[PDB]
């Protein structure tokens, strides 16, 4: 499946990126070949067909076969290279010959060059939204390969000049490939904007599928720069994912909530939080003949708990209709809900009125602590049998199938919200999921470079707001309106090895002015960070607008109650400052 491969690749890359030199010295390439570059090229036909199905368009035959051809040549070159590479890696120094050198280089320049020149084949005119996943996937390989030049270049025989041409190229394409993907995503996304419920479900499916397959991959590209991130990288994807509405309004399609009411009712950008519990509200759906009436869940309240550092729960507004029957409360405090299976029911009226609603949902939860799996259920307590409906794994497959689901899932439940149908047909619920990569503990690694998404803070000041991300950061950003000393507070987790260490702090931001930022910890370290102008006010948030500001003073931590506050100095209104990640580098003096 296109999405399943995508999800699987992003899981492999996330782990490889956490290995020094982007895992360049491990056997990652073997798994990567089986998954993305298999001999039969099945994966490609899947990506090539994935978007046709989403925008309901097609890629002309010429364009489509040319692409598969370029892809055949690329798989070959690339596999050729990987084999020459395993050899090279195994060869004792003493046994490495000029023949080996000349040969491995010749292969590298061939794969890299073929890749460099193929790219346009997946970016054809009038076929950008439809070639998207293919492009992102080939791009990602070109970059995974170019970095190899910085790791092996010198022992392969390349000179300074040669090696630098590659680095320069790498920096230039990381930017280009990133921007291309975000650009065509917005173009396709916006092409699905309509006013209907139907228009929405299509709009939200492209949004999801393209995120799992492209945007989620594009965020990893910067960690291939093994000079800027030479220690391995510990990061996470924080964005929300909306699976499709729990059941399909077959004859009811027309009665679904409008586009705007759906996009204006959904929960806006916020600090990352976790599911605590769901309060189910139930009502009766009468069948015309009474014996065929059923209870279904009409509305709900949801409780979410903030990121580490704050326990206070957040109760959402009431969603949908108040119960007519008893309310059921489920609390998932301390559990990871990795799957939901809903069952539906119907009651057709002679006068043509058909009615639907959810009579049941099973929440398969997993407990990290006790390492136990269990289930929890919402049963309306009245139904004529079970028509089937949504199974989460079909939309959000796991990272591998040869792994127990509770150990291989890719997302966890985060929110549930009911929407009402027009002409009183009932309520259709929506679920929201977050990536399994999210560390609840905000752990700072002792060896690796750690990225702390700014949305992992547990508190924000009045002058700061969480805003929708540009597209290539894997989540949302913090916008700075009013500078204060406690713009945001975080609590982080360090282990013993991590406690004996000191850390240099780097900050990924985008700003229209130079300014000083301050970082404080409860260990009384106070660091001043001068950020510089990276864009003009009238600019858009593209790849080149973000940068890394750092300080030459480091900080250390103590014990188990570590907190971090970010402050800033005053700036005039009208200047835009966006902060994305706080990075910790273990200063090994």
What are the angstrom distances between the C-alpha of 249 and each of 175, 341, 352? 42, 17, 14
Q: Residue 217 has which token pair? A: 């991959």
- Report the half-sphere exposure of 568 (CA within 13 A, side-chain side): 25
C-alpha–C-alpha distance, residues 206 and 188, integer Å: 8
Q: Residues 213, 50: contact at Cβ < 8 Å?
A: yes
What sign does the CA torsion over 503, 504, 510, 516 have?
A: positive
Class of the CATH domain delimited by 228-238+438-588: mainly beta
CA distances from 48 to 8, 36, 45, 127, 547 (A): 18, 13, 5, 11, 34
288 CB burial (10 A radius; 0-12, 13-18, 19+): middle
Half-sphere exposure of 194 (CA within 13 A, CB side): 12
Residue written as token pair 């509305």: 299
In this structure, the number of other CB atoms found within 10 A of the CB of residue 496 comes to 8
Tell me the two tokens of residue 46: 């899947």
Judge whether 295 and 285 are in contact, CB under 8 Å.
yes
Resolution in A: 2.4
Q: Which residues, in sequence order, are CB contacts of 267 under 8 Å at separation 6+?
A: 316, 415, 417, 432
Question: Which residue intervals of 91-159 are DSSP H helices?
Answer: 98-118, 128-146, 148-156
Are 366 and 373 spatial neighbours (Cβ–Cβ below 8 Å)? yes
The overall longest dimension of the chain from CA atoms, in Å, is: 88
C-alpha–C-alpha distance, residues 265 and 177, integer Å = 34
Question: What is the spatial distance between Cα 233 and Cα 19, in angstroms, rounded to a whole number?
Answer: 7
Residues found in the chain? 589
* 493 closest CA partner among 230, 233, 234, 220: 234
Neighbouring C-beta atoms of residue 315, cutoff 10 Å: 12
Q: Which helix (H) or strand (E) holds 536?
A: none
- Considering just the CA atoms, what is the radius of gyration of the chain in Å? 26
Whether 267 contacts 382, CB under 8 Å: no
72 Cβ neighbours under 8 A, 6+ residues apart: 41
- Range list for CATH 1.20.190.10 in the chain: 1-227
275: β partners: 304
Alpha-carbon gap, residue 566 to 504, rounded angstroms: 15
Whether 305 contacts 313, CB under 8 Å: yes
CATH of domain 239-437: 2.100.10.10
- How far apart are the C-alpha atoms of 508 and 519, rounded to whole Å? 14
Comparing CA positions, the residue from 30, 42, 57 lying closest to residue 1 is 42
d(C-alpha 570, C-alpha 518), whole Å: 12
Rounded to whole angstroms, how far apart are CA atoms 82 and 172? Answer: 24
Method used to solve the structure = X-ray
H/E stretch holding 161: helix 160-191
| CA angle (323 as vertex; 319, 328 as ends), nearest 5 | 90
CATH code reported for the domain at 1-227? 1.20.190.10
List residues bridging with 526 in a β-sheet. Answer: 520
Nearest residue to 256 (alpha-carbon basis) of 200, 298, 202, 208: 200
Under a CB-based contact definition with an 8 Å cutoff, are residues 84 and 107 in contact?
yes
93, with CB counted inside 10 A (0-12, 13-18, 19+), is exposed
Domain with CATH 2.100.10.10 in the chain: 239-437
Report DSSP letters for 224-291, one per residue. Answer: G-TTTTTT-EE------EEPPPSS--TTTGGGSPPHHHHHTTSPPS---EEEEEEEEEEEEE--TTST
């Amino acid at each position: 499946d296109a999405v399943g491969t995508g999800i699987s690749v992003v899981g492999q890359i996330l782990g490889v990126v956490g290995v020094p030199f982007a895992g360049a010295l491990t056997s990652f390439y073997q798994s990567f070949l089986n998954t993305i570059w298999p001999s039969d090229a099945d994966p490609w036909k899947a990506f090539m067909a994935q978007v046709e199905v989403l925008i309901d368009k097609k890629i002309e035959e010429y364009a489509k076969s040319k692409a598969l051809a370029e892809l055949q040549g690329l798989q070959n070159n690339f596999e050729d290279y990987v084999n020459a590479l395993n050899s090279w890696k195994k060869t004792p120094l003493s046994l490495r010959s000029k023949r080996s050198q000349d040969r491995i280089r010749e292969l590298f320049s061939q794969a890299e060059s073929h890749f460099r020149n193929s790219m346009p084949s997946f970016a054809v005119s009038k076929f950008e939204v439809l070639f998207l996943p293919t492009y992102a996937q080939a791009a990602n390989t070109h970059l995974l390969l170019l970095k190899d030049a910085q790791v092996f270049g010198e022992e392969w025989g390349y000179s300074s000049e040669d090696v630098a041409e590659f680095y320069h190229r790498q920096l230039k394409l990381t930017q280009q490939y990133t921007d291309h993907c975000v650009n065509w995503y917005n173009v396709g996304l916006n092409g699905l904007r309509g006013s209907t419920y139907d228009a929405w479900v299509k709009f939200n499916r492209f949004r999801r599928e393209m995120t799992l397959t492209v945007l989620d991959l594009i965020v990893l590209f910067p960690f291939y720069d093994i000079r800027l991130y030479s220690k391995g990288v510990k990061t996470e994807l924080t964005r929300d994912i909306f699976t499709d509405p729990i059941f399909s309004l077959n004859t009811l399609q027309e009665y679904g909530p409008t586009f705007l009411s759906i996009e204006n009712s959904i929960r806006k950008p916020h600090l990352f939080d976790y599911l605590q519990g769901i309060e189910f509200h139930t009502r009766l759906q009468p069948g015309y003949f009474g014996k065929d009436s059923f209870n279904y869940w009409s509305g709900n309240y949801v409780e979410t708990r903030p990121s580490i550092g704050s326990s206070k729960t957040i109760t959402s507004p009431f969603y949908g209709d108040k119960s007519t029957e008893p309310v059921q409360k489920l609390s998932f405090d301390g559990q990871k809900v990795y799957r939901t299976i809903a069952n539906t029911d119907v009651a057709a009226w002679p006068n043509g009125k058909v009615y639907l609603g959810v009579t049941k949902v099973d929440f398969s939860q997993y407990d990290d602590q006790k390492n136990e799996t269990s289930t929890q259920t919402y049963d309306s307590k009245r139904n004529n049998g079970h028509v089937s409906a949504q199974d989460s794994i079909d939309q959000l497959p796991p990272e591998t199938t040869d792994e127990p689901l509770e150990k291989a899932y890719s997302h966890q439940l985060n929110y549930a919200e009911c929407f009402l149908m027009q002409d009183r047909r009932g309520t259709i619920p929506f679920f929201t999921w977050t990536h399994r990569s999210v560390d609840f503990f905000n752990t700072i690694d002792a060896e690796k470079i750690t990225q702390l998404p700014v949305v992992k803070a547990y508190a924000l000041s009045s002058g700061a707001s969480i805003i929708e991300g540009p597209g290539f950061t894997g989540g949302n950003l913090l916008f700075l309106k009013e500078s204060s000393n406690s713009i945001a507070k975080f609590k982080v987790t360090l282990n013993s090895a991590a406690l004996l260490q000191r850390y240099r702090v780097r900050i990924r931001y985008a700003s229209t002015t130079n300014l000083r930022l301050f970082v404080q910890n409860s260990n009384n370290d106070f660091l001043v960070i001068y950020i510089n102008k990276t864009m003009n006010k009238d600019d858009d948030l593209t790849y080149q607008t973000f940068d890394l500001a750092t300080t030459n003073s480091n900080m250390g931590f103590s014990g188990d109650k570590n907190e971090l506050i970010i402050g800033a100095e005053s700036f005039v209104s009208n200047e835009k400052i966006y902060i994305d990640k706080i990075e910790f580098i273990p200063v090994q003096l």
